[PDB]
Structures are given as structure tokens and as C-alpha cells.
Amino acid sequence: APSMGTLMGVYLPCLQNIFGVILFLRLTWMVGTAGVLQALLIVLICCCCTLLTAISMSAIATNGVVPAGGSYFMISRSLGPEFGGAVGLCFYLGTTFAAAMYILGAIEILLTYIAPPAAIFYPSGAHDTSNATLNNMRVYGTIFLTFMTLVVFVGVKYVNKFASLFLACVIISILSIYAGGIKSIFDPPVFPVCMLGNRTLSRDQFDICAKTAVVDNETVATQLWSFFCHSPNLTTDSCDPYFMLNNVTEIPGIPGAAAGVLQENLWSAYLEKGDIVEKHGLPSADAPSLKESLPLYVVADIATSFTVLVGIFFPSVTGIMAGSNRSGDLRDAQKSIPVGTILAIITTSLVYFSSVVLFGACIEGVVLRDKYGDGVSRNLVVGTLAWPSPWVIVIGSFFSTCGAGLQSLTGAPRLLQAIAKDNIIPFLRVFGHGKVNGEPTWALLLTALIAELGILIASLDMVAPILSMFFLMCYLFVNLACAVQTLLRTPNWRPRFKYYHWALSFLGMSLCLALMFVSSWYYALVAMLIAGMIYKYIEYQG
Amino acid sequence: APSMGTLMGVYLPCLQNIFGVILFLRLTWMVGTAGVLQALLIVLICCCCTLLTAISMSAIATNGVVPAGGSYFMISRSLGPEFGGAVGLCFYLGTTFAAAMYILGAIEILLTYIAPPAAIFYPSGAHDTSNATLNNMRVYGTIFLTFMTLVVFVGVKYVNKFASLFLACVIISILSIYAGGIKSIFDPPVFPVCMLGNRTLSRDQFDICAKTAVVDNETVATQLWSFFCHSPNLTTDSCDPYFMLNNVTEIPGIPGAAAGVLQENLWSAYLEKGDIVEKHGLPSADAPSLKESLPLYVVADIATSFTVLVGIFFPSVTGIMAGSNRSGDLRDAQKSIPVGTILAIITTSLVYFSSVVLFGACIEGVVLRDKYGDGVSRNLVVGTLAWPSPWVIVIGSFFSTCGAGLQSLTGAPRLLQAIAKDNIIPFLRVFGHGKVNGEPTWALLLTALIAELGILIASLDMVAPILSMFFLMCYLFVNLACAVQTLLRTPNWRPRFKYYHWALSFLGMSLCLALMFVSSWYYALVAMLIAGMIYKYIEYQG
Ligand SMILES: *[C@@H]1O[C@H](CO)[C@@H](O[C@@H]2O[C@H](CO)[C@@H](O)[C@H](O)[C@H]2NC(C)=O)[C@H](O)[C@H]1NC(C)=O
Ligand SMILES: *[C@@H]1O[C@H](CO)[C@@H](O[C@@H]2O[C@H](CO)[C@@H](O)[C@H](O)[C@H]2NC(C)=O)[C@H](O)[C@H]1NC(C)=O
Ligand SMILES: *[C@@H]1O[C@H](CO)[C@@H](O[C@@H]2O[C@H](CO)[C@@H](O)[C@H](O)[C@H]2NC(C)=O)[C@H](O)[C@H]1NC(C)=O
Ligand SMILES: *[C@@H]1O[C@H](CO)[C@@H](O[C@@H]2O[C@H](CO)[C@@H](O)[C@H](O)[C@H]2NC(C)=O)[C@H](O)[C@H]1NC(C)=O
Ligand SMILES: Cc1csc(N(C(=O)CSc2ccc(-c3ccccc3)nn2)C2CC2)n1
Ligand SMILES: Cc1csc(N(C(=O)CSc2ccc(-c3ccccc3)nn2)C2CC2)n1
């Protein structure tokens, strides 16, 4: 018999789950590659679909009748059980796999940056190859998932504390990054980046960045010159003409917040796979490039385009259902779910916009698209923006991913119990009537096993678009259910009196159905096929 | 009401399906990497498991009661329907996917070698990237699969003709390769291979193989010297010391059949990924190797070991069920299936052994492990062994793969109909009572759709071990069923009177159950789980 109210019941969980980790790490890459304007447009599109879905859900919940079950109950009541069951099952699978991926990301964040100094779990995998890190993940993520499932098994009263602490840490990290940005505007930090000609080269091989140097009144080896130039004598031009013709120089990578940098970084620059990231302002002579010289540069990892960028970014904006599916507590959910969801979504969108604009206007353009940090000692560029130190941002990202995973894991069992509580799927009957007070039991086991299988895979990033397709399908179905319910003599209305809600819901449904289509039609077809199969099975069961 | 007799009914299909294409292309790689002795041992192990399964099947069929259905009916009658249904379903899936992979391999053989000159289907894909070839396959394989399904739909009376022609072509290719081997023993061909120091380098960049040459009474550019050495003047040692210190030379790659080559090629040589294949007899100085010089060599593709080699080779020895599942024709199958299966299996094993020994004793060891042909103009080494020309061997391989795919496609519907003919699986009832005369109809559609999905994947090589696991599970279950049936008061006995059949079946079952385990336990666990799920579903249906 829980009742979590509005603020903690539906606002904090949604905001905490929405943030993810894309803001801390991939946001700089996106802004650098697509420019400020295109990044703003893409974030606006994603937030627009999410806000339209939230508004449709609020309109549906205005009736104040949802007793239990998340969006699945609403969809089943409005449209019909046959579609509602399939949508709920797909959404539950997506939520479980998203929780698994969040936990994996948190574990890998911890391994790479959190405590690599403590052997970076070297005994766990010994770093023989990528398999070593994969095993380290497969073990540590499982060790953490067991604890997460154990904690979530107890009533949510003991779950909201950890989520609140994680959200507090994430907010602290965001405030620190903004303070670092303002300080850089008032006092730029130090962050040298090595650029030869007008290109950029990873500063991980040579100790110093200079074609020639003088030690003991004599020319030096110039380790940089040693690479791509095997002649250790100054009076020699044997190696590639690029070194001799072009010139090497060092430029700040974090010139702070200034009008010039932001204005120069406005437009976008998409590069195909294998290209070399190079600044445009400074000069560079043209000469043939030796094949061996290619590795000693900065090369794009994947092709860059608006559609691919939108597909990559969209998942970071999902998870608005944390406060929707969770309905056991929060008495009088009618007056709580919509306001909380809208507030959290709007705050997240505003923070995303401000962060993207600041990143565009603060950091040097060349560094931004230098993904993986190979350009500068592989260290986190955004971390240096943090006021105190990169540790604050790294720990913030780790806690954010862990908390998002925990919130998704907590949410999934409620939806599973709601689906099974109704005799809609014959073989899910046992997964109902959990512990007293309505807590989900005997379904937490199923969700935990699903997450454990996902962890055992330890490569869920391969099937990235499947979860996005599931989430978009659920949102589109919610929008359509709201539209039909309003059409079919729905008295539920906000203070504004009009029929424009029909058009709004249709616009959102079309918008981020085409969104999923452009993201990956290849997997959208598979997701639609799975939904159809579940719908046919439901029809057979009747 | 068909009756195909013994020879054509059960012998020709099994033998023509067993051959595959591994003999023509990968056999040389296996013999070169693992040596003659280890290749003989591995082929012996695979053929031993296959022959033990065949003998167990013959013992079971000695009762002369199998009216219809392949190994599934035997297993269900002996052990029990619960296991039989699951084993039959897994075997049917494996056969369908094997047919799809065979058709894909045939299409890719045609694209790469059959008719690349006819634009190599350039308009189909334009060769923009690997996606171009993938689309070419996805289209041509479907175009061929539609025709294959259409032909197989008609009674087998119109199917055995194409299989007979394909088997005739394959036998012609085998005879040609043996004749070429004997001729090389009596008259070695010409096949220069470029070796620097004691290593080997692909002869695809430079026109001639010589560190220096004289044209117009002057030193030449020496294109080979241009690669890895960018100084175009003879009086210069700027480039890597390997070229100057070591010496480059040309050696025959096909010295014919001689005692020395075979004796020197006896022992094995396993190399880890990234290694460089080098001969042992000739000398080679030691000096540092430049990083850029690495690509201009011959590098192993994957790690080499006995277990991985056995796992790779085993699928080339399966398919002995072609004459077993097909039982609609061949009246009095009791006196036909065992003799035909044993004869075909023994002939295939003998041909494999002889071919491996000849390959070991004929071709130069260095070339053998030069997979993909990059060592010598990417052209098929085994093709040059053919007496008339490589075209005979290439067409033989293409026809062999096409025929194997066609035979598997023909076999699958019979097993599907047999499974559905019995009300064991509730939802397979519709897939029964095909066209008159017992021909499979309304199940050929399902098998064709499964094959079409596999083609659309066009990358079935990724899940290679799954089909191997399915086949090994089916064979092991057949062996266990034979053992139990003989134990449970089975009067079926051959002229030899003894109870050693129990021990023989147990030995085979253990042998190539551990075979699948060593091949891939990772996927063996998944296959076992799928079989258990099918068994539980069957139990529920009762
Ligand atoms: C890299 O070195 C070149 C050297 O030419 C610089 O271009 C100028 O070249 C003239 C020719 O002797 C010199 O007198 C100038 O001193 C050079 N300019 C400078 C600033 O040194 C080129 O400018 C150098 N790179 C950069 C970024 O300045
Ligand atoms: C860095 O330098 C390159 C080349 O110097 C410039 O981009 C063009 O590159 C082509 C090479 O095919 C040159 O022919 C052009 O002269 C270069 N400038 C143009 C086309 O305006 C550019 O300065 C930089 N390239 C980037 C930033 O991608
Ligand atoms: C590659 O060239 C070397 C050159 O040293 C050959 O080794 C011998 O070196 C001496 C030293 O001058 C020469 O007089 C000999 O003529 C060289 N031998 C030969 C056969 O030319 C080395 O033998 C050469 N490579 C091969 C495979 O013979
Ligand atoms: C080809 O040459 C290599 C090296 O010259 C020989 O294998 C050994 O390689 C190591 C390199 O670390 C040398 O130190 C040894 O002197 C080489 N010979 C040995 C260990 O007996 C060998 O002749 C050839 N390598 C092959 C065939 O793999
Ligand atoms: C060390 C590190 C750096 S960056 C990083 N990352 C993360 O920590 C995120 S892992 C992740 C990815 C996707 C999803 C997801 C959620 C909902 C729907 C679809 C997908 N969830 N979680 C990933 C590469 C960006 N790890
Ligand atoms: C151009 C070319 C060269 S070599 C080649 N190959 C082929 O043509 C064979 S494609 C193939 C592979 C596996 C199976 C199979 C059958 C039964 C059970 C498990 C696997 N069937 N078919 C493949 C790489 C060797 N193509």
C-alpha cells in the first residue's frame, strides 16, 4: 500500500532516467560533427516527439481512472486488449534490455576511468585482448546486477533513496560542468592539441610536439620526427614530403567561451569513414601523403550524416515512462503523472539545448569531433571543462548510468505484473499476485534473468536500434490510443477547450513514426513483425 | 506413388550431398596448416563419427518397418515422441539453413570466379563496397532459389535428373584434379611464387620479382623495391633494413609429387593471427621490420589449432541423411537405406583421405597455407593442379555447391511433412496432406520462406556452428535411439551375432557428442536449450 506522491513518485524518476550518459560523452562529438545548428535541430526533433507523447499520455490520464499498470493499461483500455498486450510486451522487453545496457555501460565506465589504477581489474581479464575487458564486464556487471535486483526486490520505499542520491550526484556534475564553462569564458584552461599542417595527430607517441629541437646546443631526435621519418639526421629529406613541406604547430584546444569560436563552429562538417579531421582556419600545404603516415593522425570512426546522428542520439531521450508504468504508489495518479512527466521532459530538453550551445561556443571545433580522445591522450575533453576536475564529471556519468539502469529495472516488473495480472496472455498467469502490498514478485525473477542473459551477451551495443524501435512503437501506439479515445466521445479535457488535440496527436505519431523509419527501417520491419506475431497470438488466445 | 530404388534412391543423393565444396578450396589450406598427419587424423575423426551414426541407423532400419519419415520417425518410434519431435524440428531447421548456405556459396562462387568478366554483376552492386557484393548475392541467390523451389515442387522424378548431372560434373572435376596431380608427379607445372628472405609476399603490386634489374644498361625502378623502399636510387639505404640485408628470390610453388616435398610437409605449423607465413628450409637474415612493410606480406587470417580446424572441417562431412529422410520412394527401404548410406560414406572418406595425401605430397608447403590466394594473384591454387585448366575445377565446385543446396532443399519438406503428418505439434497440422502421391505441398512453402529469410540475411557464415550443433545433436540422438532399441529386446540383427552394437553406438555417441562440445560448447548450450524447450512444449501439448 504505497503512495509516493507527485514529486518523488513521477518527477524525480523520470528526470533521473532521461539524462543517461550521452550528454557527458557523445554530446561533444555530436555538436562538433554536426555543428551547433544541426545539433539544436536534432535535439529539438527528439524532444518534440517525446513531449508530444507526454502530452498525449497526460490527455489520456486526465480521466483520472488509471488504477494500475503503466502505458499498457491505458492503451488496452483505449484501443483494445489485442494491441495493448503486444505493445506492453515489446515495451517491457525494451525496458529490460535498456536496463541491462545501462548497467553494462556503468561497469565499462568504472573499468576504463573509475578505478583502472586499481589494476583496472587486470586479474579479472589480464588485458590479453578485447576478450579480457569483455570478461571483466561479464563478471562485474553480473555482480552488480545481483545487488540491484536484490535491492529492487524490496519495496520501492528502499529504492527511491539510491535513485535520489544518484540524481543528486548527476545534478552536481551538471552544475560543475556549467561552472567550468563559465570559468573558461572568464578564464580559459590549458589543453594543448598537436596539429601538423592543418591536420591533427594523436599526441600519444611523441613526448614533445616539435619538428626540431635543440639540446646541448645540437639538434634533437624529435620523436615526432622519428615517427613517419626514419632518418635520424636533420640533413635528410628521405621521409614523406608532408613533414618537410607542411609545418607542425600547437594550438589551444579549449580557448574558452568566445564569439569567434562559436561563430566559426556554427556550420557542420560531415566526414566519411577513414577521413582525417583537420581545422579550416589555418594554412596547410598540399603534397602526397605516405601510406604509413595515415595511422599517425586522427581518423573518423563512422560515417557522419543527419539521419545516422539522429538515430544515434534518439535513445538518449527515451525513458519518460518511469513515472508512468510505476503506478502502485502515487495515490491520485491523475493529478501527478502528467505534470511530473511534462516538467521533467521540459527541464531535460532545456538542459540539453543549453549544454549543446555551450559546447559549441566553448571548445575548439577540431577537438570536438576527435572521438575517443585519441587526439589528446585519450582523456575526456568534457572532463577538463568541469570546474574542480574531470573526476567529478566521470563519477557523475557513472552514477547517472547506474541510476538509469536501476530505475529501468525497477520499472519493468510493474509492467510485467500488470500484463500478467490480466488473463490476456495464457502462459503469463503465474507471473502475478506478487508479495503483499502489490510489490512485483516472481516477475522480478524473470526480468533479472533477462538482464543476466543480456549481460552474458556483454555486447548489447550491437543490437542498438531494436530498443529504439520498441520505444518508438510504444510511444506511437500511445499517441494513437489518445487520438482514438478523444475521438470516441472522450470527455477528458484540459482547461483549454478545443479539438486540436486530435491534430496534435496525429502530428506526433507521424513525426516519430517516420523518426523510427529513418532511424532504422531494417529493424523497424522486424519490430513490426514481432508486434504482429504477438497480436496474432493474443487473438488466438481468445 | 514413387519408388526410386537403391542406387539413385539413397546412394547418389547422399554421396553428391556429402562432397560439398570444402574439398575443392579449404582442403589445401587445412592440409598446409595442420600438415598431412593431422589432416588425416581430423578427417578420420569426422568420418568415424559419421560412419558410426550410419551403422547405427542401418541397425535400426534392419527391422524393415520404416514406412515414411526420415530419422525423425525412427527416433520417435524407438525412444519416444517427446524427444523425436524436438530432434526432427532441429534437424529440419538445420537442413533448411544448410540448403540456404549452399545456395549462397554457389552464388558467391559464380560471382567471384564463374563470370566476373561479364561485369561480375557490376550493375547489380557496382562494387561500391562489400555491400555491393552482399546485394548481388541477396538478389541472385533469391533468383536461383525461386527456380530451385519451383523445380523441387514437382515430383522427385524431375529432381533427380539435375542432381545426377551435378554429381557427374563433380566426379569429372575430381577425376581431373587427380589426373593433374599425377601429371605434376610426372611433369610439374609452372607456378612461380615470390619469396623475400624466407618469407612470402603477395605478387599483386609489382610486375617483376627482383630487388634490382637492368634496362638499357642501367638500374631499373624495381617496383617491388619501390614498395617498402621509397628511394628511387640504387645508392641509398634509407628504407627498412629487411630489403637490403635479406635477399629476394623466386621458387616454384608446385614442384609436383615428390618424396622430399611430402616428407618436409609432414609436420604441422600453426600460426596465430597476424603472423607471416614463411618457409623453413631456405635461409633468412634477421633484422628489424618496419611497420609499413607488414602489409606487403602474407598474413594468417585466423588462429590455427586442432580444435578450431576440426570445428571448421566437420560441416563438410555432414548431410548423410539425404537418403534417410527421403523415404516416399525407394520401395523396400530396409534393404536400400543402410547399404547406400554406408557405401556413399565410405567412398567419400576414401576420396577425402587420398585427396589430402596428394595435396600434402604435391604442392609446396608455403603456398598451401596461403589462404585467399593473395600469395599468387589470388587465383585458385588447386585449380592449377587440374589437368585441363582451373575452369574445370571452378565449375565443379560451383555445381557441387548448387547440387548440395538443391538436395537439402528437396529433403527438408519430406521431414516437415513427416513431423506434421502426426499430431505431435498442434500448430503444424495444416502442414500435412500434401499433393497426391505423398509429395510435400504447403510445407515446401515454409521451407522456401525460411531459405529466403536466410538468403536475405546473406551472412549465414556468421552462425556457422549452429547448424553443426543441430546435425551433431541429431546424429547423437539417432545413436542413442539405436542403443536403447537394441537393448529393449530388439530382434533386428545383422549376419554377425553379438551385443557389441551397444558398445559401438555408445562409443560413437560419446565420440561426436564431445566432438560438438569441443567444436563450440558456447552454441552447444544454446542448441541443447532449444531442444529442451521443444521437448517441454511437446510435453505440454499432451
Ligand atoms: C612553418 O614554417 C614556415 C616556414 O616557411 C612558415 O612560413 C614562413 O616561411 C618563411 C620562409 O622562410 C619564414 O621566413 C617565416 O618565418 C615563416 N612563418 C613563420 C610564422 O615562421 C610558417 O608560418 C610556419 N607555420 C606557422 C603556423 O607559422
Ligand atoms: C586542410 O587542408 C586541406 C588541403 O590542404 C583543405 O581542404 C582541401 O583539400 C584538397 C585536397 O584534395 C585541396 O586540393 C584543397 O586546396 C583544400 N582546400 C580547399 C578545397 O578549400 C582544407 O584547408 C583543410 N581540409 C579540411 C579542413 O578538411
Ligand atoms: C642473396 O644475396 C646474397 C649476397 O650475399 C647471397 O649470399 C651470397 O653472398 C656472397 C657475398 O658476396 C656472394 O658472393 C654470393 O654470390 C651470394 N650467394 C648467391 C647464391 O648469390 C644469397 O645467396 C642470395 N640469395 C640466395 C637465395 O641465393
Ligand atoms: C623464417 O625466418 C625466421 C627468422 O629468421 C626463422 O624463425 C625464427 O625467427 C626468430 C625471430 O624471432 C629468429 O630469432 C630465429 O633465428 C628463427 N629461426 C629459428 C628460431 O630456428 C625461420 O627460419 C623462419 N620462420 C618461420 C618459417 O616461421
Ligand atoms: C565508456 C562509455 C562511453 S560512452 C559509453 N556509453 C554508455 O555508457 C551508454 S551504454 C548504453 C547505450 C545505449 C542505451 C540505450 C538505452 C535505451 C534505448 C536504446 C539504447 N543504453 N546504454 C555508450 C557508447 C555510448 N560508455
Ligand atoms: C567463394 C567461396 C569459397 S569457399 C566458399 N565456401 C563455400 O562455398 C561453402 S558455403 C557453406 C558453408 C558452410 C555450410 C554448412 C553446411 C552444413 C552445416 C554447416 C555449414 N554450407 N555452405 C565457404 C567459405 C567456405 N565460397
Side-chain angles (χ1 to χ4, degrees), chain A residues 172-184 189 358 362 384-388:
Chain A
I172 290 306
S173 70
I174 300 292
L175 183 40
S176 49
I177 176 174
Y178 275 6
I182 54 173
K183 173 205 142 195
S184 67
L358 169 143
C362 183
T384 44
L385 264 293
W387 161 271

Side-chain angles (χ1 to χ4, degrees), chain A residues 41 67 93 112 117 188 198 225 253 256 307 345 368 385 391 394 403 466 508 516:
Chain A
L41 197 147
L93 255 46
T112 306
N198 78 331
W225 189 30
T307 66
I345 183 181
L368 267 301
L385 264 293
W391 272 355
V394 60
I466 207 75
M516 85 196 261

Side-chain angles (χ1 to χ4, degrees), chain B residues 198 279-280 284-285:
Chain B
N198 78 330
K279 179 192 289 317
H280 177 74
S284 56

Side-chain angles (χ1 to χ4, degrees), chain B residues 21-22 25-26 98 101-102 105-106 108-109 112-113 315 318 401 464 467-468 471:
Chain B
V21 71
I22 278 283
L25 308 179
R26 283 316 87 93
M101 291 215 318
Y102 278 163
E108 171 205 79
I109 285 292
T112 306
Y113 314 81
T318 169
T401 172
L467 315 203
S468 163
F471 294 170

Side-chain angles (χ1 to χ4, degrees), chain B residues 25 35 43 71 73-74 102 139 166 188 230 256 333 346 402 418 512 532:
Chain B
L25 308 179
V43 53
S71 83
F73 156 74
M74 262 184 288
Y102 278 163
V139 53
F166 294 177
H230 37 280
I346 206 165
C402 169
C512 68

Side-chain angles (χ1 to χ4, degrees), chain B residues 285 287-288 293-300 303-328 333 336-363 365-369 372-420 422 425-428 430-432 434 438 440-460 463-474:
Chain B
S293 315
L294 176 130
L296 293 180
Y297 273 149
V298 187
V299 191
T304 58
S305 69
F306 196 13
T307 66
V308 65
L309 203 67
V310 171
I312 280 180
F313 164 64
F314 158 79
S316 174
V317 79
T318 169
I320 68 169
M321 291 305 78
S324 67
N325 60 14
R326 167 205 282 88
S327 308
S336 180
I337 169 158
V339 56
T341 308
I342 289 306
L343 269 290
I345 184 181
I346 206 165
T347 191
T348 278
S349 207
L350 171 153
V351 73
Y352 267 103
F353 268 50
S354 69
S355 34
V356 75
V357 86
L358 169 143
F359 281 3
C362 184
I363 319 85
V366 65
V367 174
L368 268 302
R369 40 173 163 293
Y372 307 94
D374 49 28
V376 285
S377 70
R378 301 285 311 278
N379 56 11
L380 291 204
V381 51
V382 57
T384 44
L385 264 293
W387 162 270
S389 72
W391 272 355
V392 300
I393 164 172
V394 61
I395 60 173
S397 42
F398 164 78
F399 273 168
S400 160
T401 172
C402 169
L406 169 144
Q407 268 293 17
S408 44
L409 206 54
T410 285
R414 277 54 196 261
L415 186 149
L416 186 44
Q417 183 162 3
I419 290 282
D422 288 19
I425 278 180
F427 71 90
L428 295 199
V430 63
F431 291 84
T441 77
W442 258 90
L444 195 45
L445 265 300
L446 191 35
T447 177
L449 275 97
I450 301 298
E452 190 45 288
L453 170 164
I455 302 292
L456 267 293
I457 291 300
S459 178
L460 303 184
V463 317
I466 206 75
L467 315 203
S468 163
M469 308 310 318
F470 279 165
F471 294 170
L472 281 193
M473 183 171 19
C474 172

Side-chain angles (χ1 to χ4, degrees), chain B residues 16-76 78-81 83-98:
Chain B
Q16 165 272 0
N17 159 271
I18 296 310
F19 275 162
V21 71
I22 278 283
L23 161 73
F24 286 130
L25 308 179
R26 283 316 87 93
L27 190 50
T28 76
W29 181 63
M30 248 175 52
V31 62
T33 175
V36 57
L37 304 179
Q38 300 225 356
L40 300 164
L41 197 147
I42 180 176
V43 53
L44 177 145
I45 292 299
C46 286
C47 285
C48 179
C49 156
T50 206
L51 203 158
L52 283 205
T53 297
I55 182 44
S56 67
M57 173 167 317
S58 170
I60 288 299
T62 51
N63 311 57
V65 305
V66 52
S71 83
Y72 149 69
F73 156 74
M74 262 184 288
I75 204 140
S76 184
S78 188
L79 164 155
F83 293 74
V87 152
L89 184 66
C90 282
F91 195 43
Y92 164 78
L93 266 279
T95 304
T96 293
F97 275 76

